Amino acid sequence: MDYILGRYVKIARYGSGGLVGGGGKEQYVENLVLWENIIKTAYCFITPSSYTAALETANIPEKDFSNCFRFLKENFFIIPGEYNNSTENNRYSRNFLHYQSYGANPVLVQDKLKNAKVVILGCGGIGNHVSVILATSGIGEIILIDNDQIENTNLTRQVLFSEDDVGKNKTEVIKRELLKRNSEISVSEIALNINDYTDLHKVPEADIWVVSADHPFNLINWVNKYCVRANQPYINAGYVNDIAVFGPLYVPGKTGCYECQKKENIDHKIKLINSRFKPATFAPVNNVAAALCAADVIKFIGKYSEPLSLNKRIGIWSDEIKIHSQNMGRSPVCSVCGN
Template structure:
């Protein structure tokens, strides 16, 4: 029995497991044999041993025994005995992978082989990097030309007052190495001004974009579609934590398939000029908890994609969590067969 399986009664119903694996057991006649078998499974057993226990000491008839076994076999309640090793660094993550229906033994090596390029090491990028490094992603390339400022410290928690004035990418690299010496970290202190700058970066299995330079997402999208590199956007819109879409060239839509951000009206230069002047004074109200929300959900999708477990929530959509009431905002981002950026790609059938 997986260590993450708990049992409890609420509202007259026995629940086997909670969260995404919660199974309500309404048949009162199944409660005792199910609980006795769950207790028996505290020590690793084979299915044959479990059935023998139901038939023997429990004295359960064949029909109820079959129903109890079906309950345990569904929804990842049972996992291989060797999966959970408390002494292993990634043991708790291994349980999460099993909870998601994956073979944890296969997930961790996939992560260890992966290289992620992060564009932006600020409030979101630094937290995504920390989540990936501590999860065992093999290599991170940290790209940012900025230096640590006093105003960063409200939300960029891996930096300290002693780091003010130092390059963010180099400070973040230092902090990640302190947290996982097995993660290879390459800091790149440079601006990304055009596509040529992207060409000079190491190739990655995934690009995560959290930098907010004007035009950067479109530039990254074009580069990644051309090179066949998956990429994920993570940001915030004032008090909305936003992540997605996860673009997998040839599989999903790309950034240009659908209008995902507000833009100046075409063919109306006067209005466009007014909008540019108004927006020119904009300063984002960046907030630590909103940054953490966006970075956590983006990092989870990055791990899902790289590790091959579960389904990334940002596939073919951009999602926002409104922090004031926790409502969700969703923008569809399916592939447009007439998209000028990715229409020529041959569709690929890929399990993500």
Template sequence: MNTSTLSHSQLMRYNRHIVLPQVDLDGQELIARARIAVVGVGGLGNAAAMSLTGSGVGHLTLIDNDCVEDTNLPRQLLFSQQSVGENKATAARDALRPLNPDAQFTCIDGALTGDDALSLLAGHDVVLDCTDNKATRLAVNAACVRHQTPLVSGAAIRFEGQLFVGHPVCPPCYHCLGELFSEQQLSCTEAGIFSPVAGIIGTYQAMLALQIIIGTGDIPYGKLMCFDALEHQWQSFSVPRSPACPLCTNR
């Protein structure tokens, strides 16, 4: 008798997950109940949303105020020539639906600022920061600290990728990390991006989110992980709590 909250067809579909002792039936049920927000549905967000949807995440919130452009297509693989001009969040949802008919989606066509981020990101189990601008990153981080929600932040440019995972209650946070770097900011428009690097980092964000949901693996909380696609190396650094961080003073 099937006593799982998963249907028979879901048990068949996710069999390759369920046979892993680290996932098991309990883990797959947690994935099915999970609500995950993907902020930014560009190169990172496409790869992350694809992996999360395929893996059986129950609810995805997709947030982006950009429209699909021709120059996105080499790495934003949910989009096609027909998507050009459409909002990225709704175009991604339309491409993801056939991948998993059980998944639910909320699409938000907007940019996240302080108050918006706080209300729109409430009630999620994990938030993925897949954006490319610092103001949004800081707003998303502040909301995650307030809601005590784990944050998986990703970045990709040229042949380089970065990941940072913010703990729900312990410092450091993304703001602490930002204190370590100068304001200099390059966008992929100016600097370029090697397409598969965005896929690697976005997929890694999805993997970390699933591991947080099911509570398996050694989550690199508070670490900055850097990927070099030319040397084919990962390096990991512990990020110190910043004494100047207004969000971590009482954490």
């Protein structure tokens, strides 16, 4: 039963002791003696070693070594030796350190991604960015859904498209560009525009729908109603001008749905104002939303960490430093998924 120090752990001289690890799992250990001991025991696991083989080379008392071993193990700084049983030349090897760092076997996450099927409903700015992440991360099957054609104004956010692509179907060029990046996956396209609730029946079953299409105004309400009735997982992502939005991620029976937590003259005026609405699109906002959405899809399917947007619609601001989550937990009294 070998263990090996993760390649993603770093330690630093800091404060009265030091830091162990990098990122979300970073620990500040205030006691210098303990921290120095943690370093000494980590060093013993640089090569793949059983507990007792590493202990043999440690110059500290067994009880101190044992405590440090446990610390390292619980945070996945040391990982089973087999979790490093893949070639450095594997195209997905960088994601592997990421999987390892959450205590998962990267070969098993990869196999889950390989066998998954994802629907990209909406192939604009969000769909462009989500689809390449999912494609190059090894999701086995991607189905691109969109009826629109590429324009010159798309080139701002829609990173797969070029000047030369103007006039072609979006789904056509994305497929071309996805397969140029990862030819070991399968990519299909459906030419569909969702005019009515009934149109959603032409969208295929999948592990998850990535929904970024936002026309008409109640498209999401149709998608949610449909997915509740079809028992189909979906995630929403987009933006409200300068705020990046992703979530909720809907899982049948395991999470709340979109609807759970929800003068004629002026009424005419509101409607006209809203009819003329066009979002202040901004690539960085689009990209943040799409990045975090894809992370939640990879985690939903990989199963190695909890998706952020379970039971939540998450907003990330671009002009102030702010995240806010909006409660979208299950309501027993919901008219869509309820009693």
